[model samples]
Structures are given as C-alpha cells and as structure tokens.
Target: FVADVPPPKKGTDYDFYEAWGPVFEAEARFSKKTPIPSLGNMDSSKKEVEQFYAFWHRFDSWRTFEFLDEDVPDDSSNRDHKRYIERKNKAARDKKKTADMARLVKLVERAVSEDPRIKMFKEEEKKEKERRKWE
Candidate 1:
C-alpha cells in the first residue's frame, strides 16, 4: 500500500473518468515505459493521488463557471463609445477563450505526449503503410 485514497473535497457530481480518462491513460503509458519512483510500484502516494484530484476539481470548477457578460456602454448616445465598448468586450472574451484552451492543452501535454490510444492507432497505421509498400 502506498497512500490512503482521499475522497474528493470539491464534490463529485462530475464524472471523473469521463473528464480525465485520457490523461490518466496517457500517464499510465508513460509510467509503464519509465516507472515513476514517487508513484511506487502499482500504487501511488497520497500526494500524487491528492494532486490528481485537485487538478480535477480545478477543471470542474472552470468548466462550470458562468460566462463573462459584456459590459454595456455608459454613453448610449455616443456611437463611438458604444463601438469601443463592444470591441473591448469582444477582445476580453476572445482572450479568455484562448487562455482557457491553452491551459487545457498544456495540462494534457504535461501528462503525456500523444495519448496512448492515439499512439497505438498511429503505430497501426505505420505498420499498414510499411506492409503495403512491401507488397
């Protein structure tokens, strides 16, 4: 036994496996190839398990957060003011979206490069390509 498993503090309404299966699978693949000393053999430490749950909590909260509303122009009579406010709000929204996507991409990439499932598919394709060339 490595570390005791702690229940998720931030509730469990969301499906943990559905959201993080790919990441875990990728991590498993990496671990198999290069055993993680901290994780222990066939078991993980408390800090490692808790850290995974913490990340999931953050992901759940971020996904469920309400969208930012656009700010209404104070000077309704001024066309320029309205246009400027609209553009500002648009830029803000765009920035938020891009940042959110980049964060998720970074998180997934950090776990492993190319998900194990996807890696297998690519390998199969490569084998097929070689076989066809040989024939």
Candidate 2:
C-alpha cells in the first residue's frame, strides 16, 4: 500500500527548490515510517551540532542544480538519430570535463602543499603523531 505523498513546496530560491525540493519531500515521506531524532534531542554535544551545521552550511545547492541541468539534453530536433548523437556528445563532454578537473585538482593540491601555513600545520600534525607513538 502506497501512502499519499504531498507535493514539495515552491520556495523563493528556484535553483535550490529545483535541486532539493523533491529530495526533502521524499525524506519527509520516509520519515513518516522511520522518525529521525532532532539534533538537539540526539545524544550529541553542542560542539558536534555546531560542526554539523558548519558542514551543512558549506553545501552548495547551486552546484547540484547545475549538475542536474547538465544531465538534460536539448531535444529540439526530437529524432532518434539526433538523440543518439547527443548521447554520444554528452559522453565525450563528461569524459573531457572529468580529465580537465582531475588536472586542476592535482595542481591545487601541489599549490596547497607548498603553502607555508599548510606546511606548518602538517609539521605540527607529524610531531603530534610522533608524540602519540611514544605514549
């Protein structure tokens, strides 16, 4: 037996609505069967809740919107041949973008490792690990 699922609310931020509205609605429906504890009620400290909120606040909904938007193909021609061609094109585009991003990520990693602040942090972390080894 399927339950009556309610429609998602339309919020002012259309991009976020498009990306996470259905997800939130689906989670709501799931929660009806299995309740989730509120952060305040959960066995967690204030620092834990603050850290959780910090991670949540960093989530980029716009990036999700862009990913969903990119998954859709232009169907202006609406022919079988055109559809297959577009599929192939999308596959190639995804491959090239992945490779480009991989290179950029490696470059950023190298730059970050060279930064004085990160080097100092790594040195301190290494010293802490060594001290713990003797304990």
Candidate 3:
C-alpha cells in the first residue's frame, strides 16, 4: 500500500520553493558583475552621460564583503565555566553584516528602479521629437 502515494509536488512546502526559485536566481545575478559600461569611450554623442545611469545600477549592486569576528572570550581564573563564544560571536557578526547589506541593497533598489527623473526626461524627448516633426 506504500507504493500508491503521489509525488512530492503534492506536498505543502514544495510550492513555496517553486515560486521563489527564479526570484533568488535573478537576485544572485545582481552581485555577479559590477555593471561597468564596457561599450565605448566618452567621445560619442554624450556617451559618458548615456552611460551615467549604469553607474547608479552598479552602486546599487555594490555590497560589503562578509566579515568574520574571531575574538574569543577568556576563561576566568575563579570560576569553572568555559564556553567557545568566539565562533558564536563570529556567526552573529556575519549574520548582522548580511542583514545590513541586504537592507542597503533594498534601499538602493527602491531608489534606482523606475526613477521619475529619467521618465520625465524621456517624456520631454518625445515632446521635442513631435515638435520637430511639425516644423
């Protein structure tokens, strides 16, 4: 009778991973490159300005490297208690650093995503194009 069960897709937790897997994969890609504008130099049609926003994207992707806290607590000469607090402290620091970096990235993401300035500039460009067509 044990051979009659459905696949794990019928389970509860599998759905969560299936839904969020691509999200994680895309986010992981953000840290892979610094988003350098490797297209061309600064001599063409405001080329550097054209590449300006790329710097913002790179800044948004920037994150501090993981730090390790290796300090250990000393054993007191008067007590009989001894515990390895160094690794625990190191783990705590590492987690805090990760959380802080995540928060920073989220902040930058909000700032750089669909910024109104670029949208307004694009609107102006479209209007200029239309005006020139009528001239």
Candidate 4:
C-alpha cells in the first residue's frame, strides 16, 4: 500500500536551510552532519511566484487583474519574447535570492546560538539544582 508522505517544511532541499543547523554549532563544529535531501526529481519550484512578489510594485496595475495568457511561437514579437524571458529570469533570480537569504539568516541565528552570554541550548540540559531540590 502506498501511504501519502507529507512534504518537507520551510527548511527543505535548499543548502542554507540545511546548513543553518550546523553553522550554529560553533562549539561542536566538527560534528558529522547528515544530509536529508527532499524528495522528487523536480524539487522546490517557486519561480512564477517569487517573480510576482518581487516586481509587485513595478506591475502594481496588473496585480488585481488577469491580463492575458497564450503560448506564442518563438517567432513572435520581441516584446512577447522579452516578457517570457523576464519571467524565467526572475524565477532564477528569486531562487538565488532565497538561497542567499537562508544562509545569511542561518549565520545570524548561529551567532546568537553560540553566544556564552546567552546559553540557549542549556535550557533543556538537565537542571542540577532543580534535580537536587526534588531529591
């Protein structure tokens, strides 16, 4: 029987999402890390979307309306070709943008996580005083 498997959340096949956890481990930086690649040969397709939000202001007029849709031949006018090309280019740019942002945020989080002034990890590491009190 083929059971349905839920999709991976925010941190998926992307490099930064995977690296964010490791970069935070400054003290144990040498620890071996395992890779959990997301499924599907065609992974994390967020092209037309990122392009939409990215150039929202530039095309604000078309935001609330559907203009037109039709697959034109390659021999069409340059404007049509240019528009299609822009959409494809935007998808590539957006993917890179996402990767960069993920890595940057991971670094920031790692710095905070490693700070001795604020020991965030020790929160759940067995409390000696509390245990003694209970004893």
* Candidate 1 off by > 4 Å: 1-19, 22-71, 74-79, 104-114
RMSD of 3: 16.3
- Count clashing residue pairs per candidate: 0, 0, 0, 0
Candidate 2 TM-score, C-alpha based: 0.39
Give lDDT for model 1. 0.47
Q: How does each model score on TM-score?
A: 0.37, 0.39, 0.33, 0.32
lDDT tens per residue, model 4, 1-135: 222222224444444324433333331222233222221112333443233223321211111111233444567666578578657666666666566456445544443343332342245334755677865
* Candidate that beats the other on lDDT, 1 or 4, i.e. the better one: 1
How close to the true structure is residue 118 of candidate 2, measured as C-alpha lDDT? 44
lDDT for model 2, please: 0.42
Point out the higher-scoring one by lDDT: 1 or 2: 1
Off by over 4 Å in 4: 1-79, 120-135
| Model 2 residue pairs with clashes | none
Count residue pairs with overlapping backbones in model 3: 0
The TM-score between candidate 4 and the true structure equals: 0.32
Ranked by lDDT from best down, the candidates are 1, 3, 2, 4
Candidate 1: residue 84 lDDT (0-100): 84
Cα-lDDT of candidate 3: 0.46
Candidate 4 at 94: error in angstroms? 0.3
